[PDB]
Write a protein that binds this DNA or RNA. Structure first.
Lengths: 256, 307, 252, 300
DNA sequence: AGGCTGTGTGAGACAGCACGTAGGGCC
DNA sequence: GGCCCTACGTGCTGTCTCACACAGCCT
């Protein structure tokens, strides 16, 4: 219908005029007057933003810095001033050095192949020793590389449906005092208290049956020193996101 | 009465048109494009320019500076709290064809998949960091072939950035969209420290590159049909399942850094760029993994498969 | 151009194949002849009124009844009132509509009856029916009927009782107005207080998934029980603000 | 170069047949673009078959407040009510055979797909394209505005699935036309289901003074057993825009409860389309029941 | 010679727009 | 009556669809 389209266009134009009325700082029931005032305001103030503003806009969002390296030698031709707030390093340190020196000494095989037409790699550089990972991205021009650099008690133990140890986090060396290897391959029922297996068996048969809901139970675990301690567990069955099948039981053997 | 009344209307319309076409000259665009711009586009561009300049003057307030945009592999896009885009990077044409002039100022909800109008709404409105995926309309095919709007194919962007509040409260979101390259048409080189893979729908290893043996230690033929969830460290299971859900419901994802169990103990950090396949229904999922470091803590043993 | 033409050709081929499958009896030309011949044997709207009624009564699962606008009298009622409302047509003929509904719902019908209408009532059988209809000259109204050990209790973040269903009288023994205002841990066994406290301070952290525990619950007569509770925290769908901790108490 | 100039003319002479035979006026039946003819013939044959398998009269459709619709496993509407034009700007002729997935919001496709597949009763809310402006003037499909439809029915199988859904619309609170009664009080809720403006009629029906409800969360009045249903209804209202609840008990001021039924609605800002507040209409289905018991702390 | 696919053509109906006149409403 | 914002529609162009015309193939 022509009338509906015309009405929609008129309403859109009126809304835009109302918005421009508030946008102009100087400004008033009019349309020609408001347009003239907007033009006059715009007189005081080719691309929408100058090249000096896009840099700030990109730095605020991506939170990165521009660096330049030479393929033949790897010397840092230029580093943006924003390197200091990111890596806490003065421009002097980065300048005049080699990019291979500013990375931990096992990822050199990546940069060596990358530098020697688009480039993109993930590496780690020293933080003036804490190491951080930055997603370097950029292109290659006449031969030099230009690329901005962006930025980013208890022990979990899986189980089988029967109750076998299919995983042991490294924290078990201290939380329970047993080496991870020893616990693997043995049912969790054996390590339980002499006569407490009923509670654990019921909990294991219920966690797999109650449509996968978290359960909590307390028992008396043993230790290499032959002492009884109360450690709680939080058991819930993992489910495949798509197929929706039982993968394993995740138990967090929290210690009281 | 009628004769004089009509005459005034003609003069008013002529004056309005003259002022409208004089305003467009002020915009920072070439006269050629400015002259033929319709009135609504002129108003939208003026509004966007004023808003962006106000934001830059309020909050965001040289020899080698122009290279910044070219080095960046995405395109900046400022979005207000109402969904309006007050500025799009000039280099958005390459990734999506839609030129800056055509798209600038339009509502963001009009150029995104309807199913993704809730994630954007949540992210725009207020810890001031954002990292989310979105589906945006495109009009450029592979290798570059502009087509009409109605033939648009949705693309997935890894949107990153931080919100920013500027006193008039008004809040403008700044994002850095990055399209994810399709593995079937890789353009950047693939360095040595990488091994391709191909998993089934429910994340089961169906085919692994031969480099895995040199990188991790598992044989290419040793991991077929085994679920991938049996290898990830138990601490990264939540992140991995979130990434898998996003892959299922959005086509492509870039999973965050996690830890994958290797052979004879230890683990190596990995980053995965998933990509679903659509049969001209889904068929299979590929992945382009990365390796960040050598095996750590080789002596320690975690899973039964390593004993 | 090419893609559009290919899609159109594929759609036409699919339609031809479907039409061929539909007919009982080719070269893509005899198919249309057979289809038109078959249509001629059969068979101005798509379906007759009776055929439309046979579908409406199977979808809505209601009936039709006519009532007067003067004294709530019934002139005619569809025969479909036998399967539903469990009653014969004899009662629903010459009687008054106000006498076939709940006594407390007379005012609603009286106001609604006296050009569209809609309301909800409960005819005798009690059931719930969503009456809808209009008004036509006769004045009469035409409208179509239609048809549609555990112990629950809420809790605050700390654990103070805030709501208990009437089933507490049988499940435990106390009255519903006694448990309110008293912490659940007070009613638990002294030995099991630690587990319940840990679960209550952990459920808030574990938001979105239910948590289950076990302990001993008292009763009106001094003794011990075994109650398994499945407590899950509640969050607003929009604001995502912790409001209350549901506790679907179960007896085991 | 004779069969091409002969068969094509022959096909049109045949395609005009199978079109005039359709149960439609000859004038309208003679202006179909060689595809709607089949789209209607196949649908008519399928609905006649399904009709045969299943198998004041002309007043049932008029009495009904919704439009009957039939959907098969694929999603091809094989029949629609003759009165669909009243609610939706589309008509039976041009919307009989098109895939249902072509006239629904993309986010709502999953619910329909689940519902179609084979407990036979079904009940869901879906958004269907509407081209009827508020003023009542029909508009072209190129400017369709989404409309929420409340659908009920039961899946059926014929000698091969099917579906018979009797969709109805939900009246807008601000454009109400059906007369009210003495047991209906309006109310306004904040976006998080927080009371912000309550009609003065609750003081007579429930037992709460109007000044005692402004601010308190709504979820602290529903009975515990209905919390899941109310949460689902509120989520549907937030995601879609309009929802009709079931039968949830409401706590009184001195004990017991009174049943209710809510028809929520959402109001959108006209400057940025940001949702403002939730408006609801409440019915009452009975009086106070079990008045000699105390459930919550407030009633105590 | 039978139907089947791949290819371009002219013609009717379209939305986009701008610009007209006109009631009608503030002074 | 003095301006000034709204309400419907003439004409126009650039697009949309649809059915009509040559290439070619196993029975």
């Amino acid at each position: 219908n022509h009338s509906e389209i015309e009405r929609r266009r008129r309403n859109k134009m009126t809304a835009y005029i109302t918005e421009l009325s508030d946008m102009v700082p100087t400004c008033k029931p009019d349309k020609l007057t408001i347009l003239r005032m907007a033009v006059s305001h715009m007189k005081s103030l080719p691309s929408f933003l100058t090249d000096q503003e896009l840099k700030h806009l990109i730095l605020e969002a991506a939170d990165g810095f521009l660096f330049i390296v030479s393929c033949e030698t790897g010397r840092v031709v230029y580093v943006s001033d924003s390197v200091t707030p990111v890596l806490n390093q003065p421009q002097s340190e980065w300048f005049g050095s080699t990019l291979y020196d500013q990375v931990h000494p096992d990822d050199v095989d990546k940069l060596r192949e990358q530098l020697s037409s688009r480039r993109s790699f993930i590496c780690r550089m020293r933080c003036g020793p804490h190491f951080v990972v930055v997603h370097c991205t950029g292109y290659i021009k006449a031969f030099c590389l230009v690329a901005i650099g962006r930025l980013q008690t208890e022990f979990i133990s899986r189980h089988n449906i029967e109750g076998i140890f299919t995983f042991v986090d490294h924290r078990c060396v201290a939380t329970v005092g047993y080496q991870p290897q020893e616990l693997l391959g043995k049912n969790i029922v054996e390590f339980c208290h002499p006569e407490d297996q009923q509670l654990l068996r019921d909990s294991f048969q219920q966690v797999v049956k109650l449509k996968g809901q978290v359960l909590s139970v307390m028992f008396r675990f043993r230790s290499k020193n032959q002492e009884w301690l109360w450690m709680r567990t939080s058991s819930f069955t993992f489910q495949n996101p798509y197929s929706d099948e039982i993968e394993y039981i995740i138990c967090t053997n929290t210690n009281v | 009465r009628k004769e004089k009344s009509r005459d005034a209307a003609r003069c008013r319309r002529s004056k309005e048109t003259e002022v409208f076409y004089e305003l467009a000259h002020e915009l920072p665009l070439p006269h050629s494009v400015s002259s033929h711009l319709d009135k609504a586009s002129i108003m939208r561009l003026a509004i966007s320019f004023l808003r962006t300049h106000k934001l830059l003057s309020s909050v965001c307030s040289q020899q080698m500076d122009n290279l910044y945009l070219k080095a960046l592999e995405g395109f900046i896009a400022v979005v207000t709290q109402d969904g309006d885009m007050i500025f799009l990077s000039e280099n958005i044409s390459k990734f999506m064809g839609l030129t800056q002039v055509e798209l600038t100022g339009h509502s963001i909800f009009d150029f995104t998949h309807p199913c993704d109008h809730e994630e954007i709404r949540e992210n725009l409105s207020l810890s001031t960091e954002r990292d989310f995926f979105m589906r945006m309309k495109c009009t450029v095919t592979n290798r570059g072939r502009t087509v009409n709007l109605k033939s648009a194919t949705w693309k997935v962007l890894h949107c990153t950035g931080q919100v920013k509040v500027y006193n008039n409260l008004l809040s403008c979101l700044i994002i850095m969209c990055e399209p994810i390259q399709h593995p079937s048409h890789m353009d950047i080189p693939l360095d040595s420290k990488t091994f391709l893979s191909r998993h089934s729908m429910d994340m089961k290893f169906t085919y692994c590159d031969d480099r895995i043996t040199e990188l991790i230690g598992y044989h290419p033929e040793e991991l077929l049909g085994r679920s991938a969830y049996e290898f990830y460290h138990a601490l990264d299971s939540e992140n991995m399942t979130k990434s898998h859900q996003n892959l299922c419901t959005k086509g492509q994802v870039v999973s965050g850094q996690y830890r994958m169990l290797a052979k004879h103990g230890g683990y190596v950090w990995l980053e995965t760029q998933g990509t679903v396949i659509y049969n001209p229904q889904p068929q299979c999922i590929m992945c382009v993994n990365y390796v960040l470091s050598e095996i750590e803590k080789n002596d320690v043993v975690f899973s039964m498969d390593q004993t």
